[PDB]
Design a binder for this molecule. Sequence first.
Ligand SMILES: Cc1cc2nc3c(=O)[nH]c(=O)nc-3n(C[C@H](O)[C@H](O)[C@H](O)COP(=O)(O)O)c2cc1C
Ligand SMILES: Cc1cc2nc3c(=O)[nH]c(=O)nc-3n(C[C@H](O)[C@H](O)[C@H](O)COP(=O)(O)O)c2cc1C
Ligand SMILES: Cc1cc2nc3c(=O)[nH]c(=O)nc-3n(C[C@H](O)[C@H](O)[C@H](O)COP(=O)(O)O)c2cc1C
Ligand SMILES: [Ca+2]
Ligand SMILES: [Ca+2]
Ligand SMILES: [Ca+2]
Ligand SMILES: [K+]
Ligand SMILES: [K+]
Ligand SMILES: [K+]
Ligand SMILES: [Mn+2]
Ligand SMILES: [Mn+2]
Ligand SMILES: [Mn+2]
Lengths: 445, 445, 444
Amino acid sequence: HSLREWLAFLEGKGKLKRVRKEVDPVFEIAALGKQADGICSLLFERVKGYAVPVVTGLAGDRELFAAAMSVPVEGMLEKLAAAVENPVPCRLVSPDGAPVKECIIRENIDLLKMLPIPTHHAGDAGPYITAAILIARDPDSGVRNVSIHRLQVTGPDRLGILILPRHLWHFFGKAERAGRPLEIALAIGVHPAVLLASQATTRLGVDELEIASALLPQPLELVKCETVDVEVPAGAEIVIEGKILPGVREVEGPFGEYPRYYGPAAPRPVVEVTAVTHRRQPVYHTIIPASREHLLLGGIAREAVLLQTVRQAVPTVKNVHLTPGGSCRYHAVISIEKKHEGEAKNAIFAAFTSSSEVKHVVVVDHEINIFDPEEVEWAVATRCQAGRDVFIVKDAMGNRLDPSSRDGVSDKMGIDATIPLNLPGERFERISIPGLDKIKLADYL
Amino acid sequence: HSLREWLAFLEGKGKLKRVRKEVDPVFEIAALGKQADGICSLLFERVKGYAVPVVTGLAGDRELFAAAMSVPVEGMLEKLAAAVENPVPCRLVSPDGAPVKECIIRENIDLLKMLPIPTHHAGDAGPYITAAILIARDPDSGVRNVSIHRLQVTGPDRLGILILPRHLWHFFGKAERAGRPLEIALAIGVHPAVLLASQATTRLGVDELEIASALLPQPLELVKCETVDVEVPAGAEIVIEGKILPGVREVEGPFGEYPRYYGPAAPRPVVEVTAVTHRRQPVYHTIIPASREHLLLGGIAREAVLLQTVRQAVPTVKNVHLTPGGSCRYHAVISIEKKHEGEAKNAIFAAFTSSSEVKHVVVVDHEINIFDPEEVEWAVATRCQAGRDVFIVKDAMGNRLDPSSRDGVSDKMGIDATIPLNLPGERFERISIPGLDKIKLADYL
Amino acid sequence: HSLREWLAFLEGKGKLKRVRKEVDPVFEIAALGKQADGICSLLFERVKGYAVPVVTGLAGDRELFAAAMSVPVEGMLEKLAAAVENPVPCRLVSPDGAPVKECIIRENIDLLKMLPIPTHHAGDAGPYITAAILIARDPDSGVRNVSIHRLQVTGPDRLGILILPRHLWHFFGKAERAGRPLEIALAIGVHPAVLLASQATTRLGVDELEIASALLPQPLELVKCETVDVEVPAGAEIVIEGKILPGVREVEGPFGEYPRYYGPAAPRPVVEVTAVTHRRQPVYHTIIPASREHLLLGGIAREAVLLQTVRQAVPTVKNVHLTPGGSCRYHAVISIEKKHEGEAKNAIFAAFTSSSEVKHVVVVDHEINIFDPEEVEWAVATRCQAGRDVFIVKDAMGNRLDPSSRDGVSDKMGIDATIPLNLPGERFERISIPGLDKIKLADY
Ligand SMILES: Cc1cc2nc3c(=O)[nH]c(=O)nc-3n(C[C@H](O)[C@H](O)[C@H](O)COP(=O)(O)O)c2cc1C
Ligand SMILES: Cc1cc2nc3c(=O)[nH]c(=O)nc-3n(C[C@H](O)[C@H](O)[C@H](O)COP(=O)(O)O)c2cc1C
Ligand SMILES: Cc1cc2nc3c(=O)[nH]c(=O)nc-3n(C[C@H](O)[C@H](O)[C@H](O)COP(=O)(O)O)c2cc1C
Ligand SMILES: [Ca+2]
Ligand SMILES: [Ca+2]
Ligand SMILES: [Ca+2]
Ligand SMILES: [K+]
Ligand SMILES: [K+]
Ligand SMILES: [K+]
Ligand SMILES: [Mn+2]
Ligand SMILES: [Mn+2]
Ligand SMILES: [Mn+2]
């Protein structure tokens, strides 16, 4: 189970369409991809200036992510959590025969020359590599980490990188204050399960490639790199080996980001690329920022944690959802089977503790479909009284990229839209038409 | 421009579909209609027990209401407001030739026998007439009023009626405390402009039929009734002449209502029907409660007022929307071109004064599309800080049918999701792809 | 490492004192024990009406609980958490030689006759067994659970029991709706690590005796029961074998409980005792309700969870404390090394999600000693401004036994007493005396 096998699966399900007409990597790919967002993947067979085709939108809805993990939607968060608790080791494989080693390139590396790296949004500083998993080992303990980071193409052999302060930063800090570069490898064009695993949010020790291989049916085949002590998936379309230079900061950005605002420009670390390896006739994968693919990668991983955290406070939680309206981050909707009066407030506290990104939270009862915005809005309209069901907390920790925040400090709000417990059960009884699910309109026209 | 001409218009636009298979008026009509809600009108050609077909969903979206008023959507609220300020008189027409007089019936009236009156929701007390405009004159001044009222079929010649305390109640009170019945006429199967006008909310003096005839291209042709001193539209499919009996109260309801809850049963007025008149091969119109047709009839009329009221406080208001999530009543979204800091709070006050039904209000900037729930949710997620942008007012007047309310007393909430004025300008700049509207995906596959 | 070895350790440290004068089990034991609360254990050598002595206050402070787990205080919560994640199996041991089998008693069982079961607080319905771990197996899966439950003595061979809805209730429900009794065994007089493990709060599958044996240096020796399919610690002073009767409810309580208020009386399940086994010259252990022993048993277990939960929101949390003022439940004090402005509010949310019992929370900086009430009060006095550092949430889920609550619904409050980040930093510099730790008064 690799990217090729996944694109075939999409094509069999009618969720991949080919674009035969020529398209400019500057803006036209992003433009066309936005119109396909959530509906289908696009494979651009002819990208102006390049032999290599571009693909986008490998998974734009939660049903396809569930398929990528070989589960039904309803058990998706449970399986992701299970994969994080019981990682499965990978298999090292020989360089010869490994598809990613079909073409090695160690000299005169010019990334823009060889790869159709798109330029996505108007205010972007340049072309960006958006779908590369970044693999690295701790310089002390030797254990490896995977994360995804935007990479501005700033030269032939040179990338700017945004490293937020999580595990890659920890590694980089050790290398930097010992005067030494951090060796990395970037894999582009991998199976969605692998991308999803890069977003798993865990203890410091754990290898996300091992989380990925718990998600896939077979263990994940890896191969050693040419110029760095790092292993990469042998089935990847493209691999870029490099190192993050110590003490160097160059201006990266701005860049259109997940919340439909521009991430500000600033001096940030630099990758020097030491080799590129790829398949014969490789496919380039780009993730269009703010697309459903982008949002759900982080969203589903966050949701898996949110469910566990809410379960601690409210064991009878049924479901959780980080809405696309909130960039699958900021807004959370929890459904609970309420057993104790007050429980909804406690659920909201749990939602806030799941992540500092969570800003507004609404809680509804088990019967409300939280993946239908209209149904939750309905619940808020008719089951919330703001004087007793809303609370606001000022000046908590939020998110720097939310432009309403005061330098990452943010206010928070909770909305209890659950029915009061111990009342006449006919007061909030939602109207219904008997035999609705039994009858089907298509049978009558 | 009548109902027949409207159904033909729908059919020409692909928004009416026929259901040839037999359907039970008890539940199956409502069930099938719910699946068409917002997509298309359904004409049930074969209703079990009856020659007469049933139609539902004459207008399920705002574009079709705009078409029914012969305007583009963007000028719809302005035209409805204009029609209320400058009503146009109707034309009295001769009984012979008038289509609604083709079949008179003055004896052995059994409504359930002749008309396919559906039973809509599980907990409904019985079959209900849902789409009848009710016309009546003031016993003193003689000026007429139009409103729509649910009518429970409680006998062959007998209907229970809910009269909320507005203009029909005022008329009825005068008649009742003078010991006398109030003469009424019910017209079923009229043009959507006529229905929409019955919801216009005005000074006590004004005739909504005259509002309707300002909305239509020709003035509205009327004809005198057989047994009551009341005029009805000559083009109606069905007319039911009757009188509201003085001093009589019989149990009406329960009934599934606009907010997807059951209106409770109670003793209420009674209509005795004195005649029925109709076209040869009449079409019965039902409005399924809580359908888009139901919600938008009241919604658009309320929106027209909301716009004017918000304009008083904020002259640069761009748009207003009472959302279907709030039953086109409870939730309001206002867009303003903000000229003065603070303006959004003042807009919210105006939204509250438009109607006591308005409970939660969010204000966004001119560029946000307020008819897209995701775009307004996005604005709330990224441009609201609850500590300074939300306010809550306890124990105001709300709505009895909102079950969260304390006997019609309700809390209110306002959310200012506008950008602060006089700021750096690129902070809230929404990302974009240049040439997006110029490029079109269908041209590339 | 057993109870005997523990009492000797206490005596060697000067934290056990003997009471040679005669004492009434009705009220005088509780009264005297309350005055020793937190200072030392008391061994009552002469209890009016009985040969058997009573012991109380096996561990009244967190240093002694740490010692009972063979760790320094600073690593105590980490070790309890480690023991819950990696339970270690017990050793089944032969009945002969096992000290708890020295005296078996299967007939004419009269508990008040044989055991000096105290009556603790004024409004208590009677004598209560307060320190018995209760062991039981699931009727379906067969896996065992340990919890502590108050047991009213309502007859010679009969106890009333409060079962709150956790694991024992789950077991009991299965047995009850299949018409059958639930077999149990009560062990009294065990090592404090064992008691502490009975309070560990875990997944449904896990055996707390196995948590206890991870806490002890050697695995915990167990022995099969006489009349029930249940194992008990072979080293226990006293064991009471019995069964919880199906369909029977008898009035239990009232009883003075952890928050210094009376748990109300109500119809609850009944234990019929089928045997009693004990050592020759046994020691009876009682836990005085609301004592430090009582509070810290639950407190430390809750603290281990609270630390993990706060760590999720604030990875740089240093320490957590459920204060005795709040019955080691209701009030939480968190210390954090603050890295991001706002972090304290998020820590408070985590404190609330740890448990619905948590009502008021204060957060201070890493340098404040949160086990000194005066130092945290000082921090609140000088680093909190209520207008921006306090928040209140109305009508959340609380606790039924908190009498200020509206039928278990309770308001919550958070207090951020951390220094604001990015200020001068020398404004809040606390005064100090150089060479204070180097100098020692007893030397002068
Ligand atoms: C499309 C995409 C782009 C991302 N870009 C960045 C980025 O540029 N910088 C960054 O710090 N994190 C970025 N992330 C987030 C990390 O990939 C993610 O938080 C990851 O779990 C961090 O791993 P760690 O906890 O092992 O460090 C991105 C995530 C996705 C899905
Ligand atoms: C489908 C539908 C059903 C309605 N049913 C009722 C009803 O049963 N009772 C009632 O008082 N108003 C009902 N109304 C509202 C009145 O028709 C409306 O408020 C009208 O504007 C009142 O007229 P007036 O202002 O001239 O009194 C309904 C409206 C619609 C769109
Ligand atoms: C002194 C003491 C007395 C207790 N008394 C009771 C009680 O009477 N009823 C009860 O349900 N729990 C009581 N508990 C609580 C249980 O021992 C504790 O909640 C246990 O962890 C439940 O475990 P479980 O999750 O395996 O059921 C007491 C705890 C202590 C320290
Ligand atoms: Ca509520
Ligand atoms: Ca704002
Ligand atoms: Ca402070
Ligand atoms: K990761
Ligand atoms: K009207
Ligand atoms: K337990
Ligand atoms: Mn990681
Ligand atoms: Mn009127
Ligand atoms: Mn347990």
